[PDB]
Design a protein around this ligand. Structure first.
Ligand SMILES: N#CC1(NC(=O)[C@@H]2Cc3ccc(c(Cl)c3)OC/C=C/COc3ccc(C4CNC4)cc3C(=O)N2)CC1
Ligand SMILES: [Cl-]
Ligand SMILES: [Zn+2]
Ligand SMILES: [Zn+2]
Ligand SMILES: [Zn+2]
Ligand SMILES: [Zn+2]
Ligand SMILES: [Zn+2]
Ligand SMILES: [Zn+2]
Length: 220
């Protein structure tokens, strides 16, 4: 695997979005991964409808604004046989009756792949596949108010992941402690959070915040 990867500059990543007052991080993590793979496939970058996931992926076991799983969204897409674009079915940070329209579908998936649950397996996936859906332990105020730098939180749990985000790459930086490899992570809380909406999460410090523990991508 290369020492550095950043899919953003290869055109694989849409603008940072803001889930707002809806517990939909899983849906943003899911669209971002599907967006990267549709782009690998068609050469076209099209924003996908989180709302469409929020409103409709209930039979796959998502709970709308009360939460869900990325795997669950990928199955939805597969079972549904398509997914509407963002602009055909725009995001409203609530849940409403399913409004899916096959006419505006712009994306599909044939399933999904779970990646082996350690960081080296994740690095290869990110290197060869593209943006990868992951959950982290985001339940600490240091993360809620993250600004800049490699994020490292001492009581983060490798087992207590609570928040789906999107690994768009990875690399390295100079640091006083020479722990300076990071994962490049796209969040769904707005441009004003982190570094334009992104956080650098420590990498190869013992699966920090459990980033390698629940990582998957859809197959298109
Ligand atoms: N925004 C936001 C909120 N948070 C979530 O939506 C979280 C995101 C998540 C957390 C850990 C993950 C993944 Cl892939 C995703 O990795 C492994 C852990 C999975 C266990 O978590 C669940 C099991 C099942 C469910 C479904 C049953 N109710 C939805 C939901 C969850 C869930 O908690 N989803 C609602 C506040
Ligand atoms: Cl959230
Ligand atoms: Zn959207
Ligand atoms: Zn509405
Ligand atoms: Zn999975
Ligand atoms: Zn903490
Ligand atoms: Zn924690
Ligand atoms: Zn979340």
């Amino acid at each position: 695997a290369p020492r550095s990867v950043d899919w953003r500059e290869k055109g694989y990543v849409t603008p940072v979005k803001n889930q707002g007052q809806c517990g939909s991080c899983w849906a943003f993590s899911a669209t971002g991964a599907l967006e990267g793979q549709m782009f690998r496939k068609t050469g076209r970058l099209i924003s996908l409808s989180e709302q469409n996931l929020v409103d409709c992926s209930g039979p796959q076991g998502n709970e709308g604004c009360n939460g869900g799983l990325m795997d669950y969204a990928f199955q939805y897409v597969q079972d549904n046989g398509g997914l509407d674009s963002e602009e055909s079915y725009p995001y409203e940070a609530t849940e409403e009756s399913c409004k899916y329209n096959p006419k505006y579908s712009v994306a599909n998936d044939t399933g999904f792949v779970d990646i082996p649950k350690q960081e080296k397996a994740l690095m290869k996936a990110v290197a060869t596949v593209g943006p990868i859906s992951v959950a982290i332990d985001a339940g600490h105020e240091s993360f809620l108010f993250y600004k800049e730098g490699i994020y490292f939180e001492p009581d983060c749990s490798s087992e207590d992941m609570d928040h789906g985000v999107l690994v768009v790459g990875y690399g390295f930086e100079s640091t006083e402690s020479d722990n300076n490899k990071y994962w490049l992570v796209k969040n769904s809380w707005g441009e004003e959070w982190g570094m334009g909406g992104y956080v650098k999460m420590a990498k190869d410090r013992r699966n920090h915040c459990g980033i390698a523990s629940a990582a998957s991508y859809p197959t298109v």
